[PDB]
Design a protein around this motif. Structure first.
Motif, PDB file in Angstrom:
ATOM      1  N   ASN A   1       0.823  -1.205   0.000  1.00 18.25           N
ATOM      2  CA  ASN A   1       0.000   0.000   0.000  1.00 18.25           C
ATOM      3  C   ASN A   1       0.859   1.258   0.000  1.00 18.25           C
ATOM      4  O   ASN A   1       0.554   2.226  -0.706  1.00 18.25           O
ATOM      5  CB  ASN A   1      -0.941  -0.007   1.205  1.00 18.25           C
TER       6      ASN A   1
ATOM      7  N   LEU B   1       3.799   1.478  -1.278  1.00 15.09           N
ATOM      8  CA  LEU B   1       4.361   1.563  -2.620  1.00 15.09           C
ATOM      9  C   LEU B   1       3.344   2.068  -3.634  1.00 15.09           C
ATOM     10  O   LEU B   1       3.706   2.828  -4.539  1.00 15.09           O
ATOM     11  CB  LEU B   1       4.899   0.198  -3.048  1.00 15.09           C
ATOM     12  N   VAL B   2       2.082   1.655  -3.507  1.00 15.40           N
ATOM     13  CA  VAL B   2       1.044   2.142  -4.411  1.00 15.40           C
ATOM     14  C   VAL B   2       0.869   3.648  -4.260  1.00 15.40           C
ATOM     15  O   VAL B   2       0.787   4.382  -5.252  1.00 15.40           O
ATOM     16  CB  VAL B   2      -0.274   1.386  -4.160  1.00 15.40           C
TER      17      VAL B   2
ATOM     18  N   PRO C   1       5.071   5.528  -5.363  1.00 16.08           N
ATOM     19  CA  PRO C   1       5.888   4.646  -6.200  1.00 16.08           C
ATOM     20  C   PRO C   1       7.367   4.988  -6.101  1.00 16.08           C
ATOM     21  O   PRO C   1       7.761   6.133  -5.869  1.00 16.08           O
ATOM     22  CB  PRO C   1       5.351   4.897  -7.612  1.00 16.08           C
ATOM     23  N   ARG C   2       8.189   3.953  -6.270  1.00 19.22           N
ATOM     24  CA  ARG C   2       9.629   4.097  -6.106  1.00 19.22           C
ATOM     25  C   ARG C   2      10.191   5.127  -7.078  1.00 19.22           C
ATOM     26  O   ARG C   2       9.848   5.144  -8.263  1.00 19.22           O
ATOM     27  CB  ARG C   2      10.316   2.748  -6.310  1.00 19.22           C
TER      28      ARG C   2
END
Lengths: 122, 81, 135, 80, 87
Positions: C4, C6-7, C10-11
């Motif tokens: 979550n 990461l969503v 984002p990287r």
RNA sequence: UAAGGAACUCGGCAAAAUGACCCCGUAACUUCGGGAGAAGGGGUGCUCUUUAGGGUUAACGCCCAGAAGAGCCGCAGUGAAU
RNA sequence: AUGGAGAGUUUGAUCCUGGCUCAGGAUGAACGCUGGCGGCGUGCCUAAUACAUGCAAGUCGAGCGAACGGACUGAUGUUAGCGGCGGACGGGUGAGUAACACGUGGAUAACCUACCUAUAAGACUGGGAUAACUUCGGGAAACCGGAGCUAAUACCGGAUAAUAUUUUGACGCAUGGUUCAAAAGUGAAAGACGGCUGUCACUUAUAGAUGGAUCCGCGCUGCAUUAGCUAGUUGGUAAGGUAACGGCUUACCAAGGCAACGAUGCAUAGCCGACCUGAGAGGGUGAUCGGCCACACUGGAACUGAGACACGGUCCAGACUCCUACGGGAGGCAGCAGUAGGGAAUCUUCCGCAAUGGGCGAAAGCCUGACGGAGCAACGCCGCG
RNA sequence: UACCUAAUCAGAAAGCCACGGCUAACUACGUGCCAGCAGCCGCGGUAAUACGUAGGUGGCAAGCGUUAUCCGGAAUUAUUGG
């Protein structure tokens, strides 16, 4: 009737959009000038760019005035605004065009490139 | 420029423009007269309407107006009648 | 992080700052604007030719040249080889590659090119250092 | 043929003959694969505005009505 | 209008042609509608030609107009003959 | 008062110029109140059509205000004074 | 199963962590040194900078009038012109555009469509001009204006004619649908043939095909040190006009509409199939080829036309460049070559319509810098020395 | 113009980069922290396989190196995979 501290429009693409005068060449005590007379002047509004820039001291010729001129036959030519054109100390213009009408009396003063590069000789 | 076809096309364009604008001017005069007669219910409403429908369909045949535009003018006129 | 996290975030990878920046910029004299070009080489004018002392561990007088490129950019360039014929107002071709000792020299003047002679006595390695095939 | 149908929730009924329908759907992330909820607001026509804020309604598309509406109200099933 | 024509698909001095139904305004090697068959004029001796029958007669009935050499190609398969039989 | 517009002068002293009402716009800076009418733009006459408004009312009628059109006339319509 | 290699470097020495660097594959490459050939490709990435000079869109005398001109009555040309079709295709460029522009999937019971095809019904009857030509004037050109004639498949008026419009009765919300029975009003051509007709011109309705138009779901850059954006804005009611729905526009009502699921703003950018790299997941890119879009010195506008608000069309403004007897006129290579300039950097001012494709024509044919080929460059791949 | 057929000649047709470790390829001479080399580790201060040259070697070859930019190596944004 153009005297010092008189603001004139420039009718050319020299860069100068409007200028004011300091002296009228031609004589000790000379006070006024009309079409065909040269004046020293310093520009007050220049275009961005242009060859002449703001605050310079330049020779210039009067091409149209509101006082206007009598001609030998009793004919008078008047205009709705003062105007001037910068010169290169050889009776030649600094810019490459010339805007607006010009009076025929400049032919005599040998300002021929001014009379040749003009919308209307009058 | 001035390709020979282009130079002629200018002459036939103004020629067609002169014929075209005269015809739609006559149409629009008839249409305005037709609907102004309908509004006050004058005695001459019917043939003025017929004069307008005649000129509207004649120009739609000349591609002066589109066909679908003719029906809107025609539908408007007869509905008010 | 969690999926979550990461969503939502984002990287983000790191940007790569490239060496030899003055080769990545062009100029537009009509619009008085700088452009992006990514040029292999640039051509400039030598405004100063001299010699620079190297970094502390080393000791040797290294020749360099202050070059104003086609852009309005003034860089310092190395002069590889033994002998060079460059003075002021010399047109040179400048490539990438920095000198480790010399601090402030990030470019190399290409020898054997426009208004830059090669090495007089070079016999092996003539691709670099200019100079044509002897005999 | 068939025009698309959506089911959503009334989130605005402050305009006459117009309601805003919130059609919430799911979109997966391309990289991580998690399904994320996202919502889209639809402006729908209803001549007799019987829909009130909070109703789940049935929406079907149509020709452009006004600058934004492209949908009509088909069925109202909730009361709230 | 709609034309049944040949599209060049060959290299330098080795042309290969596809029999294609396309609009007249479209570029030669550009947008098309349907591919009908192939035409190889540089094969061993006789130029090998391949033509479909159902679509070729479908477009001819729809008003597609063969060019000068597609007419020849459709004739060598009798396509123009059977198109003529159904008056 | 022609043309020029502070070149007068110790100094724009004096004089000149803005001024009313309506609409639109208004910056830096602030002690957050102000700055501010800041600056900077546009209109105002007359006649007719039209038709909102509320005020006294039993209603006629009497008051005081609006909006949209179509004209008319002069160089100029807060045509003077403030 | 077809696919995955590490190494150097912090210390007196060590193990971690961690950054830096190298070994690989690529490019529209450039530069340096060299250089034999061939076949396939590729070749201004920068100044959407400015352009000298040549060509890049004409065709139909079987639509028809010529001072026509002229073999031999005059074949044939178009000198020149009217008229039809074409010039909206093909070719170029990527400036603008962060958008239903593009990709994908749908919808239009809110839509237009010349040529092409098929089916029907037809093509009746009259009239007045004007190009060309002759002759006068102007003007420095560009061109312009008077009189006198002349045709057409040029133009105009009546006749008749549909599923065209108005009023009538007999679904997926706006409805669609085909019968009815009234009213208004909507056309056209001839040419060249054969013994009345054939061909290909036409007009009106239908359908088909083709080409366009609009709407919608999803996808599609960075920045939050860009947080509040809009006021036809958002909805409604009328009217207008559009091929067509629609704030598309205008009046009048109401205060609405979008936004941390990133409104708005700023910067950047044509999009895609696809290309490079990687074991893959991914990351980067958008040369050549194909699809879509946008643009044509900059900026507005409409006319003709089925289709343009039009690269080698028109009008106006602007900036340039050129002619002028000073009153006035002409121009637009981001078509193919080519020149100047900028740059590290990118080519011949070539041959031909022989093939394929396109326009026009009954065709022969004409035009085609599309295209098919040649010229130059190790720029690349492959093959042979 | 491809292309084929006859004569004729080994004649007219190889260069580029490396050789300290990463990383295949070492000796001698010149210089002496100079001249210079270098992607990193770094070399050069009279006995440098690291600089220049000569032999030899090795890698490719009508090409060979350098520069510019992208991916990899980088698990160094780690969803796979911190």
């Amino acid at each position: 009737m153009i005297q010092q501290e008189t603001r004139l429009k420039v009718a050319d693409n020299s860069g100068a959009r409007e200028v004011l005068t300091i002296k009228v060449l031609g004589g000790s005590g000379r006070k006024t000038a009309n079409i065909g007379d040269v004046i020293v002047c310093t520009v007050k509004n220049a275009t961005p760019g242009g060859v002449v820039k703001k605050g310079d001291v330049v020779k210039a010729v009067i091409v149209r005035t509101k006082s206007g001129v009598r001609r030998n036959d009793g004919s008078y030519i008047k205009f709705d605004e003062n105007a001037c054109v910068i010169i290169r100390d050889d009776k030649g213009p600094r810019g490459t065009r010339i805007f607006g009408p010009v009076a025929r009396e400049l032919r005599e003063g040998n300002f021929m490139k001014i009379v040749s590069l003009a919308p209307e000789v009058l | 420029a001035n390709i020979k076809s282009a130079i002629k096309r200018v002459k036939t364009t103004e020629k067609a423009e002169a014929r075209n604008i005269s015809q739609k001017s006559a149409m629009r005069t008839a249409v305005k007269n037709a609907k102004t007669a309908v509004s006050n219910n004058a005695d001459n409403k019917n043939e003025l309407v017929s004069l307008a429908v005649k000129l509207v369909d004649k120009a739609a045949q000349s591609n002066l107006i589109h066909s679908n535009k003719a029906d809107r003018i025609k539908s408007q006129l007869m509905t008010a009648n | 992080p969690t999926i979550n996290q990461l969503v939502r975030k984002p990287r983000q990878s790191k940007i790569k700052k490239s060496d030899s920046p003055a080769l990545n910029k062009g100029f537009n004299s009509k619009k008085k604007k700088f452009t992006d070009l990514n040029s292999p080489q640039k051509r400039g004018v030598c405004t100063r030719v001299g010699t620079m002392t190297p970094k502390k561990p080393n000791s040797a007088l290294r020749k360099y040249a202050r070059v104003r490129l086609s852009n309005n950019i003034e860089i310092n360039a190395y002069i590889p080889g033994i002998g060079h014929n460059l003075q002021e107002h010399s047109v040179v071709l400048v490539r990438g590659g920095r000198v480790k000792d010399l601090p402030g020299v990030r470019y190399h003047i290409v020898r054997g090119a426009l208004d830059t002679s090669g090495v007089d006595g070079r016999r092996q390695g003539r691709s670099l250092y200019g100079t044509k095939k002897p005999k | 043929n068939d025009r698309k149908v959506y089911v959503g929730k009334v989130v605005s009924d402050k305009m006459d003959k117009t309601i805003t329908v919130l059609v919430e759907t799911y979109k997966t992330h391309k990289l991580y694969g998690k399904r994320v909820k996202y919502s889209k607001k639809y402006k729908t026509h209803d001549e007799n505005n019987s829909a009130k804020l909070g109703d789940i309604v049935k929406i079907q598309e149509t020709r452009p009505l006004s600058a934004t509406k492209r949908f009509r109200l088909v069925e109202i099933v909730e009361e709230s | 209008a709609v034309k049944i024509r040949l599209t060049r698909l060959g290299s330098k001095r080795n042309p290969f042609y596809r029999i294609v139904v396309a609009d007249a305004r479209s570029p030669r090697d550009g947008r098309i509608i349907e591919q009908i068959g192939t035409y190889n004029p540089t094969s061993a001796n006789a130029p090998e030609i391949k033509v479909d029958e159902a679509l070729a007669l479908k477009w001819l009935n729809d008003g597609a107009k063969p060019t000068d050499t597609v007419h020849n190609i459709l004739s060598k398969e009798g396509i123009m003959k059977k198109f003529d039989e159904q008056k």
